[PDB]
Every structure is written in structure tokens, then in C-alpha cells.
């Protein structure tokens, strides 16, 4: 991979130097991979900062982008991810733009990866309060994207992450069985679109990662939510968490609670419980 860097808009070029890090601060190791690969080619790296203290952090390299368009529009992209910042959202460490190689990603590694895979985990003992616990944090890293005017557009207990705190990550921001009825017929995306995927998602934390609609057809998603069926309530979900749920699955995009009531809905809920295995 060899893309020319000087074809790149001079304006740009300056607006993307705050995100910008490089091989004075940052070491790949490119021969120690991270993961299965749902997130992509991503390595192990070490930040170092200007006295030399060292940051974990997965490297992701961006294999599939070869033209300057996708260069410009993935430099944008780390424009808008940089300003965020929120306890319940991935940070973006930086970006490498290089003369030879794909661009990279930075951010902070996650101890514990992905949520679908640390509660499907039979080793690991997340009690009801716990998993509520998690869909809360969710929930308050989808109120200040939705704050900043984002829409996810892939919310999934797949793409949030969970660090050596137990902190949730909201991540792989910017699966027709997370999509809500208007996605799937007007492709359209919204706020309103993820508080659909966040009622799937707190359906997964529920079951600990079970498959949503096992029995039904990926084509066959669109006519069983128009026919008024939803996800069963599953067994260690309380009735007032998955009454949230239904709300979520509401038919009328703009009935549906919003981030800000999600979380203070949920957080009563939370209150109300017990017992913890997980504090964050
Ligand atoms: C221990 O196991 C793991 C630890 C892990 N630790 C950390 C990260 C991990 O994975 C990733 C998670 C998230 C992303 N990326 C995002 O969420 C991105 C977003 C929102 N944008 C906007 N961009 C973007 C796109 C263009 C330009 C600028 C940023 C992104 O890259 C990348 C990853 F590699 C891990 C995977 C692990 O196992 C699989």
C-alpha cells in the first residue's frame, strides 16, 4: 500500500494535525495481533508521551482504503471522534497518516474486548444488577453522542467494550436484527434508529449474548415486526426493564424514549437491585 500523501488537501491536511500521531510517540507491533478480526487488522501498540511513560493501546490498520477520497473522508472521521469525550465512549488515541502502509487507528486497549464475549463467557458471573449495570452505562454514551448530534448506526453488544474497570465503551460508531422497521424498509438512520438497536442490546445483556430472534429469517424480520411481534422477554429480565424494551420497538419512530430517558429510567431501575459482581 503506497498512497501520496501531497495529493491531500492543504486545508485539511492542517484541520486533521491535532489527531495526528506518529513514530515519535507511537510503536506497532506488527507481528502481535489483537482479536478474531470483526474489528478488523488491529496489532498491539505502546503511546509513549514526551518523558516516556508508556499507554496500552490497539492499533488498527485500515487495509481497504487506497484512494485519497477514502483517506479524506477517514480524516474527517478522526476529526469528529477526537472532540468526543465521554466515560462510556471510545477514545480516539490518534491516527497515522503514512507514506507507505494503510492508515491507522489508535485507541486505548480494552482488557476485557468486546461485552457479547465477556458475558457469553461461562466463566464470568455477571448478576442481573450487573448486566443492567452495563446496559446504563450503554445508554449514557448514547445520550452524549445523540447530545453531539450522532447518529451509531451499528449499536450492538458486540461493539461496546468493556476496559480492566469494567467501564463500558460505546465503540464502532460512524445486522438487520439491531435495525429498527423504518431502517430496514427507507434506509434510513437516526437517534431514533439506535434507540431501537439499544432495546436489541439490552435484550443480548439480558441473555447473556443470546442470538435475537433465533427461528426467524434475516428477510423474514421486516413482515414479523410489522405483524407486532417483538423478542420475548428473557428470563432474568425484569418486567420494568423489558417494558423499556417494548418502548424501544415502538412502530412510531418518534414515540420512542430518547437517550436522556432511557438513562434516567434506567438508573431507577438499576437502584432497585442488588448485588454486584462488576462495580464500576
Ligand atoms: C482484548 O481484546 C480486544 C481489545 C481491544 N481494545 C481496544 C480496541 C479493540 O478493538 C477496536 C474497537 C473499536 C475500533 N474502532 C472504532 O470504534 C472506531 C470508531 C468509532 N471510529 C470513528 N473509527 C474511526 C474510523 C476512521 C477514522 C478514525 C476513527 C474507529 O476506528 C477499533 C478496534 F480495533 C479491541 C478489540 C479486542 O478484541 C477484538
Known sequence: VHIDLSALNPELVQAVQHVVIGPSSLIVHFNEVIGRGHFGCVYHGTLLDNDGKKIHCAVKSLNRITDIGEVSQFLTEGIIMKDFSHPNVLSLLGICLRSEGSPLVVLPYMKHGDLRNFIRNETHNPTVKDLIGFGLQVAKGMKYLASK????????????????????????????????????????????????????????????????????????????????????????????????????????????????????????????????????
Not at 160 to 180: I, N, R, S, Y
Not at 256 to 266: A, H, K, W
Request: charged share 25%; with cysteine; proline share 7%.
Open 149 to 280: 448530534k450522532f447518529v451509531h448506526r451499528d449499536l450492538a453488544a458486540r461493539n461496546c467494550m468493556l476496559d480492566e474497570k469494567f467501564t463500558v465503551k460505546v465503540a464502532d460508531f460512524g445486522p438487520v436484527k439491531w435495525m429498527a422497521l423504518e431502517s430496514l424498509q427507507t434506509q434510513k438512520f437516526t437517534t431514533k434508529s439506535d434507540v431501537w438497536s439499544f432495546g436489541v442490546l439490552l435484550w443480548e445483556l439480558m441473555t447473556r449474548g443470546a442470538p435475537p430472534y433465533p427461528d426467524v429469517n434475516t428477510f423474514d424480520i421486516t413482515v414479523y415486526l410489522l405483524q407486532g411481534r417483538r423478542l420475548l422477554q428473557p428470563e432474568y429480565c425484569p418486567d420494568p426493564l423489558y417494558e423499556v424494551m417494548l418502548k424501544c420497538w415502538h412502530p412510531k419512530a418518534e414515540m420512542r424514549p430518547s437517550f436522556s430517558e432511557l438513562v434516567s429510567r434506567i438508573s431507577a431501575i438499576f437502584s432497585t437491585f442488588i448485588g454486584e459482581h462488576y462495580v464500576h
